[PDB]
Design a protein around this ligand. Structure first.
Ligand SMILES: [Cu+2]
Ligand SMILES: [Cu+2]
Ligand SMILES: [Cu+2]
Ligand SMILES: [Cu+2]
Ligand SMILES: [Cu+2]
Ligand SMILES: [Cu+2]
Lengths: 336, 336, 336
């Protein structure tokens, strides 16, 4: 508890752009420590589709979603947040993992040219959303990309229902984002000089509750082809997914969610053998799967219109040998 | 079972406008009893926002949502429903807690000037939605405010997964309502003389499946500022939330749902350590939380556009001493 | 595992139009077998409402949803899929129950005039969605009716949380479908000659994410009146529900879901005493209920606007004697 006791081991961590996850250990290597992270909020224009649609994003570390921070239950997460003097807005941060002052948002308001340091004890294990929440403009900052997630691993690592340890070989972080880009009378998306010039039009669109794009990792096709996530037959993978503003229903086409903490909380036992899971807006979830077959797999939001029309689909390229017991073409497409 | 056996202890209860809950005991004080409630349906105009938008509501006891009725498993809930002769429509009631005749709706159709008495055994423990369901106009009455909820507490009170008793100090009831108010060619909401004059326009809006307002307790800001819910550090609070027509994803900004019966049923173990929970349209849920930090907390539907743009946000004013172990500002917003 | 070992008992099954389920046994009668099914995809015009709205459906065995296939855990499902030479499009199939090649979709692309045979081991118990998924046109084929579901029963039948066997007397399959029919400037739905002529307009509607109709069994009122599902007081019924593209929240008006596998997976314990359950788009779920009272019951998607305005409501006609202990009208609607 005491302020003198918090002078515990400190550990500076360097973050790695979504979606790889910075280095960490699944089983806590020692006792509680103060884990240090630094993030800069960047207001910048990004292209969200193959047709050149520009968006004035508000991005932690320049990415959409912001990076995944990983700590263990009972460690203290100390974050240094910086708001560049070139930015035009005040920003703060709300960790769903934190207890108090609006997720930390009440203690972190910084205008262009300032920085602040917030520390909180990660008391609850699970994956949680974090995002900017400026008074009067909460929705707008969040739907501009300003959100991400953190993982508070139990000190002894992950397990299933009856305490059986679940260790993953790889971990990926998929941040799903809903964008509301305005259009002109000609149906062509609009461009603006500064973020603020877009506020009014953007809000008229937000109110319809219908996004124009729904993307993984900031852009349509951001995680496909050359940027496809990878694994091999036999590897245990954990996929952390988050949606700060609206619902999503992840589905691994060709596979399943062997263990899924749909609510993202590790003290709540995982659902098993899932085909499609549900993550409500404002939450993060995690699914663990062991690959059985090689090939490409499509990871999508199972509202297939959002997946294939709006932009919410990613690829997994898996290597290994085919298993004919699991599945096999008895008669390939042939004339009748 | 027998009709002669139902002549058990009777208990008349007086209801208290949402969202306080009428007096009751968590642990059933004795044996089964017949609990008596009386409600009047009021057709009246209400203002749902700060810009003066009028709605012809259909409100149980004059409120939106209607009051919370609390009983214990196996008690009989006897309700006297009255439809004032000044009303213009027939109304009935459908308790999701009841078994038979369409939730009781088939046995309770009353035109202006009538009353009826329905009794049912509360066989299943949990929170359940109730609402008017007149044949041919079900959606319309429900989205006009005519819904509320009841709680069927286990005879021995609430508990967590391993039978550990969970006793709350306070209980609040948040009814979330989606309104579909029509607009004229000028984008200005429309006013009508009688509820029926609005039916046609209202339906054209309902079909878009997009509400114009989503409010807690009948109006934008109904539960903020002076009307903020209260608690103190250390108090155990139960928040019952209900949505009779559409989905919501509650989130206590700055806190969590320590135990959440997302499905609202007490025989289904609660999820623990939740950041954001999901309640499907047509259901009620409950979250139990012990306050750890003082300050204001925002209770919202985590689709932040519905929260901050459409009207779905409430406040919690908590008193007590700040805990710097949980969270602390190491460096307040300062120049860089 | 071995190819020689797969020469096990074969069993040809004849499918029965939704929603009756082909004959089967709840407890696996022997050892693993190769269960054989045959389906033909039919491109045909269907009327989805009482106002004569035509849709160019893509239907397995001529129905919307396609039939329910039932097998046991570890059996092999061998499906012969045929694409009539009169059809105009290529079609394939994606079983959420299968592991590999995109649910089998990568191994089953067939143009008009072809057939193929795919086999997969049903390793995971639960209800799963299946649907066509042609590259470049996935959403469009699915929202045209091309989806259905299968059930992989545990070898020893269904049970609740503590292994207590749950045997059903009847089983019904409700497939919920969201349709996006285009309209002309006059608000009147449009008709087309061939499916392809509709593609462009249909997509403009899909992007709004708002269906024009949401129906059970292919049409508004498809399962009402003369086509009402039936049961009697005392019968245990299992209702399998599926939604391949969007969310639904089933509710049995007048009853409950005694045991509900909302996620549709049998190794994930069921939630009990449900009023309204949630099934995410891209998944199938199942609810078990024992009827207690006679009368009509409405089975609906609890977003009452989709239920009563868009078309998502079915009937259950139950016979037996009324139980006055559960519910009783103490004072019928009378003057005040
Ligand atoms: Cu911001
Ligand atoms: Cu939040
Ligand atoms: Cu009414
Ligand atoms: Cu209802
Ligand atoms: Cu097809
Ligand atoms: Cu699928």
């Amino acid at each position: 508890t005491a302020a003198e006791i918090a002078a515990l081991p400190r550990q500076k961590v360097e973050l790695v752009d979504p979606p790889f996850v910075h280095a960490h250990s699944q089983v806590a290597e020692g006792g509680p420590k103060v884990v240090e992270f630094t993030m800069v909020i960047e207001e910048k224009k990004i292209v969200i589709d193959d047709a050149g649609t520009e968006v004035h994003a508000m991005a932690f570390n320049g990415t959409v979603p912001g990076p995944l921070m990983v700590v263990h239950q009972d460690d203290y997460l100390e974050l240094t947040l910086i708001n560049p003097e070139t930015n035009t807005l005040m920003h703060n941060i709300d960790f769903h993992a934190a207890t108090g002052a609006l997720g930390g948002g009440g203690l972190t308001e910084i205008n262009p040219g300032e920085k602040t340091i917030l520390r909180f004890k990660a008391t609850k294990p699970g994956v949680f959303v974090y995002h900017c929440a400026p008074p009067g403009m909460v929705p707008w900052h969040v739907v501009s990309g300003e959100n991400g997630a953190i993982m508070v691993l139990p000190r002894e690592g992950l397990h299933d229902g009856k305490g059986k340890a679940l260790t993953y070989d790889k971990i990926y972080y998929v941040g799903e984002q809903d964008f509301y880009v305005p259009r002109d009378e000609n149906g062509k998306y609009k461009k603006y000089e500064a973020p603020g010039d877009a506020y009014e039009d953007t809000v008229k669109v937000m109110r319809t509750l219908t996004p124009t794009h729904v993307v993984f990792n900031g852009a349509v096709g951001a995680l496909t082809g050359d940027k496809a996530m990878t694994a091999a037959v036999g590897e245990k993978v954990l996929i952390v997914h988050s949606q700060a503003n609206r619902d999503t229903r992840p589905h691994l086409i060709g596979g399943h969610g062997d263990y899924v903490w749909a609510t993202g909380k590790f003290n709540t036992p995982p659902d098993v053998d899932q085909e499609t899971w549900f993550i409500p807006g404002g939450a993060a979830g995690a699914a663990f799967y062991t690959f059985q077959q090689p090939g490409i797999y499509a990871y999508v939001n199972h509202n297939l219109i959002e997946a294939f029309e709006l932009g919410a689909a990613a690829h997994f390229k898996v290597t290994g040998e085919w298993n004919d017991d699991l599945m096999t073409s008895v008669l390939a497409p042939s004339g009748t």
